[PDB]
Symmetry: D2
Subunit: 462 residues, 4 copies
Amino acid sequence: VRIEKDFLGEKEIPKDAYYGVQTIRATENFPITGYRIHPELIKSLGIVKKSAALANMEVGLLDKEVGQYIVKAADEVIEGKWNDQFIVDPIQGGAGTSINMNANEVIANRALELMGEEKGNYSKISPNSHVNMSQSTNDAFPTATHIAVLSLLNQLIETTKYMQQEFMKKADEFAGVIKMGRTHLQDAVPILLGQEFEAYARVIARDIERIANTRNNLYDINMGATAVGTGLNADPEYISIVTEHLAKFSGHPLRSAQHLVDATQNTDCYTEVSSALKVCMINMSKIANDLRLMASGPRAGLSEIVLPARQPGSSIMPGKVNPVMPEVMNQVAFQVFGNDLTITSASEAGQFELNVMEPVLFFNLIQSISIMTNVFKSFTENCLKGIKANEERMKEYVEKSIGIITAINPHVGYETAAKLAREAYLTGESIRELCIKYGVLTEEQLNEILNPYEMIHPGIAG
Amino acid sequence: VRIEKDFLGEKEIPKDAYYGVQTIRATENFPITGYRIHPELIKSLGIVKKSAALANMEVGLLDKEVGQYIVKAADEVIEGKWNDQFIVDPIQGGAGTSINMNANEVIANRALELMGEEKGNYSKISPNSHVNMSQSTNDAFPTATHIAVLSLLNQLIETTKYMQQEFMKKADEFAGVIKMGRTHLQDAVPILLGQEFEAYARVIARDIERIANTRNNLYDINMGATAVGTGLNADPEYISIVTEHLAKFSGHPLRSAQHLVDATQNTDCYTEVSSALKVCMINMSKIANDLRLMASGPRAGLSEIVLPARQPGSSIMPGKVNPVMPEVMNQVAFQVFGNDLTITSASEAGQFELNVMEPVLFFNLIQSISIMTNVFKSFTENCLKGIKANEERMKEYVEKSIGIITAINPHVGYETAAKLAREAYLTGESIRELCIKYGVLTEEQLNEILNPYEMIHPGIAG
Amino acid sequence: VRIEKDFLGEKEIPKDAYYGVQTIRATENFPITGYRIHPELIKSLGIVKKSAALANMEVGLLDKEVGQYIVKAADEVIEGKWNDQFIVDPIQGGAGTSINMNANEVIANRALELMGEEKGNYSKISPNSHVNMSQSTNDAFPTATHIAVLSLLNQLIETTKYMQQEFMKKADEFAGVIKMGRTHLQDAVPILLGQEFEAYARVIARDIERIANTRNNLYDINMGATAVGTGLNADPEYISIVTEHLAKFSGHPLRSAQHLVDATQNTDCYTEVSSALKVCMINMSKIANDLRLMASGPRAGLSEIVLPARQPGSSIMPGKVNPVMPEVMNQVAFQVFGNDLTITSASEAGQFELNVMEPVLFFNLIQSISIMTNVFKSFTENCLKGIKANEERMKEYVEKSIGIITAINPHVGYETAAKLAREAYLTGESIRELCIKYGVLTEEQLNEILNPYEMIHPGIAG
Amino acid sequence: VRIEKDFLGEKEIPKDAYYGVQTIRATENFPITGYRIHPELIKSLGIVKKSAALANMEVGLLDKEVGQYIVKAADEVIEGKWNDQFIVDPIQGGAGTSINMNANEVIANRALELMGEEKGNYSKISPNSHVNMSQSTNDAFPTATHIAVLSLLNQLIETTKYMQQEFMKKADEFAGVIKMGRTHLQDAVPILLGQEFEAYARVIARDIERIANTRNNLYDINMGATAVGTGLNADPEYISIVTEHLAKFSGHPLRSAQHLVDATQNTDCYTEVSSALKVCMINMSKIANDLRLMASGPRAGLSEIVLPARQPGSSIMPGKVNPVMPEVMNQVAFQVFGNDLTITSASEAGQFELNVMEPVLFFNLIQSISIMTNVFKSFTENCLKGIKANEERMKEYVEKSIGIITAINPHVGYETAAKLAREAYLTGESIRELCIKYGVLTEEQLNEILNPYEMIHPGIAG
Ligand SMILES: [Ca+2]
Ligand SMILES: [Ca+2]
């Protein structure tokens, strides 16, 4: 145990800890959720502190002997070597100061240790003076967040694409599977199961497109903004160098925003991201609902498809296969809807040159991207690739249906069709085994009218 | 044509019009939705002004010569005689001031006409000095709203109670109708359709209680608050008297709030109402979702219940009955959900001594109550009463199901019960047929065990 | 007085009215809000039906005698002659069937009248067989909606651009006005009032881009889809010709969707639009909150700006001007936020081949575009143009602020800068007095360091 | 490692682990958030299992020698010793099946270890047959949740009551502190700081009552409902006995619901609780916004209150004390709003006999109560108790205001009051000074009229 001192008094900090008194006070102030910030945000903080250390050394502001160790420590943070030292709550007042200071304290203490000094000796390496040199909370925090959000969006994009590609493969696989289209949940006209899955795949491709476009506004960062965006005393060469480093180490084509005040006080880039995720989850939710309806049964349901079994069934009641993978998809969508409201409210609560409600916004943005990335993985792997069709049941739904008289209609006339429809309604007799009974269409010409392909695509009529 | 002057200038007003230059200025500021305030709010403003005049005259503050004509004019407003004269947009800046002034002008000008004077002659009877005497925007507008909301809620309770009883009648009409319970949309164990319709009756009874209890915090009113709630220059006798008239003429047991500063700045009684209406519509939307599933078909659906046709049918596809009445119920649910978010945002936006976002708040609270009332009566009259059951088809479902085995199990044992269920599901035979052919139970034994009542109620083995 | 017959019986229809029985049945089924659909939707229905008629006549499907009067009647609808005749509630079951049949009946009955026939004589011109020929509810309704929303969006874009520019004008006008930046509502470092208004202009510039970009997906229409998306019985020449007309008459670069099943069952174009509307109103609400803060006072507030007076005064209380215009703006934002949730819920609610929740979805989308257009136009005219800066009071705030010391710091050193700021804060003396008192700097040096421009832009101190 | 086989195959389980393959299966299906269920829910699952074991033993269903060990194991779960063994994601498909089984496995394996057997020997003590005897997922899970939410609500009530009591203590402390009331952020009329704090204290009192009344519907549990609510095969004696037990071990007055189907498929008790939490946070956010506004400054803000400092300030920026405790209060409210939408959407998604979306619902409800309890504690101990007033600053807002004229008005007539207000607006002369210079009132007369208590309480015209 070690002994750090504060405007509030002494606090005993374990010798093996890299955080200090400020981080502790933060945990005292905000024991709200018990969560820790996403390791990608931790990594991103390291990137910011590395870039800034490097830039400050380059412009002569930071001593090269201490900077060298500051860089080595930050690198270790980037590699995920110190995740457990980041202990502040994601829901914290102070507009992210605690998060920023946790990163400054840990990097300063690891630097000091790397140079054979004691921890807490902030005279040698100051969390504020050296590690946070030329930065404010108001630029270090949002810039690390932009970077972390962008990296997680690239992962969600490559996971959604994989999933989208597998929906397409199912579409192709069910390309000739004839079924009964439903509107208002009432039997309509024939459709191909492959057309439904292409529908799912096409909406998902438009989701990928929307989510990808939201990265553009995140590429503008406010590094060099200082407290408010005015850049008071900031060296314009520091700004140029720090941005360039941030882009190189993050892997993103970062730009210094054209108007730093704007970039410092506005939060539309995050609401833009959340909006696209919500839209995407709306579509996923609907698809999941369909999949669950289609899997219903086995005897009093639609029983159109089979989903892979993913929980042990009742060992005394077969046939009951709960669609747990789509269900979880639905509940995530619901998280994301809720997350989006929180983001919305946090964003409109901004005042003058800072929105102080970012910590709950970022926590929610990051949670959204992360849970989506994770359900897409498990749904794809555990449900989607394995989906099978009950093609006999769906073909019988079509043959015994009334709506197929729409395909026959123009070959026999509005007269004949309505008599056949009304009789198939009262007697429940097949429409096919009725055209041949009356002799209006031969066995051979029914076969080209009631063909799966002909019935579900534009072609000759009146 | 007539000509009144304002701080913005002289305005030409139609000869017939009873509103004045401040109403016209409010229609220029806020040409927002093109909508008009609810006639029930128009009515309550009438009750507010009449009560004020009566109190003021008695306190010896309003000239009895003018006051009696103000009263007469207000009575006409209460009768819904001048609804067309309330032209201000419900979505307006000014914290309701325009709404208040719309009532003041209209009641001033009509009073003036009743005593032979010119309209626009504000020297004789003033909208501000006489019709608005002793009251502020921040007491008249909210008080009228309480009275209007409460009146509206009373109608909803009455209508929701009627709907609840009709659900309960269907529960009894369906009391012996056996069917398949579904969990996760998968077949489970038997249930009666009457148990589901009693499930619906009960949640609705719970909503009625919740909605009813939100009345209490609305009975407290802030009349005499003046600008801020401190009641500076207000007369304690005017306060007691106006409150007693407001209670007598509105029909509600209205009370003067204990702390008028609290009553002027806080808006929780409004969000308390919306919440109970949100909860109610979650249940109704779900109920409606079930009904649309239950009415699905006719051939490729569930086909458990038949809903009265309200849409004309095609002569190409009979048996296609779209469940439009549950559909519109679903859509009203979604309105109310959205309205509740708007109420939330507007309520949390209060500042110091006054919430200025009250109009959009009140507009949404009034619309939620009104549209619920309307959908409830229409759903009750054009759907709920006419619902019929497909008993024969539901009995089939039960006969061919696997869940059935849960009733059979304790008369056979874990081992044989499971092998029967497994074989029934794989071969497609009914569990009854298998019980006969393997000799495990007699046709008579199975008729006693699969008793529709015994299968769906608590009770040990034999 | 006229008697049209429906499956629900004999019904009296005013001989003035151009709507028929299917329309008043929807008035009975859905007496929900009392509202009528947007004139822009009405117009687009007219474009849809005109286009249909032309395309049906060209392919040989429609009688040219009857078709010419349908076109003529459709033009009258397009030109706004018949708005009164559309009486159905925008919140309705039937998935837009009534909205579509409202348009069908009105166009038939006017085309009959133009031909010299009787209203109701549908044996001559039928609202189903002629006016609705080759179209389903499931394509004419959404196609009309796409056109309407697109038209409205183009209007909102023009208005929003006008507002944006007006913000840039104020940016330039205030480009020399110095004041205190606030982070956490706590005094920070100086900022130009112009940088704050430029920040507003830029986020609005991003809202315009985001909203404009939502148009692309609405350009894809599904005319030709029949019930479900397959185009069962459709003629490909009808589809290419109708699509060409719709695009010419609407003024929009419409395309037939590549996959009609997808374009028929998915609703992600509408949620995409609403999202960009919500995002915009988040920034606009924030801005407006700022304006109300900046305008607070005149004695116990901030008093940084004056907004045009838009409501009458109290001669008893001058100086009091409520910022009603930013107030209505915050309120329209709370509405759009609610509108967005209603839209989310309705879009998530889709099932298989059709989302039947489209009517409440569309009502809310159209409402959000309309109310945003209206407040933007009004806010620009009645507030934004005439905003004034209180230069004197803001320079006052700056001279006695502590943050001023961030500018002086590099010219005097940390130890003396901190000394002076602590003393200035505790004693209430200006930093400027204290720099002279101890002669750490002279009047002349202070006037050059404290240059408005240099304190608010990046650059090395020396 | 040990070896448990699954319908999906072999899986290695650590020697020290008490969960099994079903739990591992769950973690592979649902790697969504990485969170673990709340300790309170864990405890409650323990209470459920112990109550069920005791009931099953009494009724002769469960072996008393196995039962005794099961009960002892469950008691250790209740005691909080096996929290780390609960590894399943709160967000999961399967309607809580894996939360339920996680508890079944853990207790079985500890019961086995206590009775000297090998773990995974489910032939001795089965998680399904023994630990889960006479229960389904569809009753154990919700029953545990009712119990857990009740316990957490009772803690929230106590905490909020404490905060409330402290808000009242501060109203008394500021009972004579005079300030300027604000409407539209415009100076209005004098108010006491204590009157504001009483308004705060009073809204919270109403929140306490709302949240408390929410407990009633939760007292009804569905224990004994089995799959669907029908109680097929359930011993009625077991039901009433397990109910008496659950009430006794949980400390709540639990009652067996009067209709088990209703209780099994409806979730209105959850949405009701959440609505009451949301309303509470609407008020709390509003209060924090005022506090933050009043803390603003120190030189260019309002600065009416000082809040205890909770972060280390900048040594060169004294006076800058960010209101971090209110800021975190806002962020939690925003969180609760979104949580409430997720809940709304989860409840709405119920189908027939089971709402499978309960996991994301319960996760959200519990987080809402939890984070509320936690901010309330921290805000009270670190902010509220220590709030102090700048009474001089506030006093001079009142001396220098125009609105102080309202107190003078009746004593000098409106005509005279308007003249004095107008000059006060032009010159800047105190209204008090003006009254002296024009001799309208004696210095001693002003002392009665402009007395803090007199100015802020009902008192008449002379
Ligand atoms: Ca197959
Ligand atoms: Ca003091």
